[PDB]
Amino acid sequence: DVTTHAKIMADNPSWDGEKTIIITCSFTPGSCTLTAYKLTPSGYEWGR
Amino acid sequence: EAKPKFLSKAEREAEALKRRQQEVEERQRMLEEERKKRKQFQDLGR
């Protein structure tokens, strides 16, 4: 997910790394757990 | 203000051209400030 997000960021300059997130809707038993994550500037450089 | 003035069709479309030039100028300004924010985010990890 951080490589996908950082490749999308590196190829599209309209994706500001402060404002763009990855919400993950994980399928827990009988439910859904949502967690939003942001890329730090270390993470965008590594995932790029 | 309160009383609506008549504006001619040439004057109306000149006002509309000036309006759309304004907001395409602030779209350009927001896009180059977006490039500035992007360069700032990029070199804090590099």
The amino acid at A13:
P
**Residue A1 Cα, gap to closest chain B Cα (Å):** 18
The 10 Å CB-count burial string (b at 16+, else e) for A8-47 is ebeeeeebebeeeeeeeeeeeeeeeeeeeeebebebbbeb
Method: cryo-EM
* B37: nearest CB among A16, A40, A42: A16
Instruction: Say if CB B38 and CB B31 are below 8 A apart.
Output: no
A42 to chain B: which residues are within 8 Å by CB? 45
Let me know how long chain B is: 46
d(CA A39, CA A22): 9
Beta-strand pair A33-38/A21-26: antiparallel
Subunit contact B41:A18, Cβ cutoff 8 A:
yes
Give this entry's resolution in angstroms: 2.9
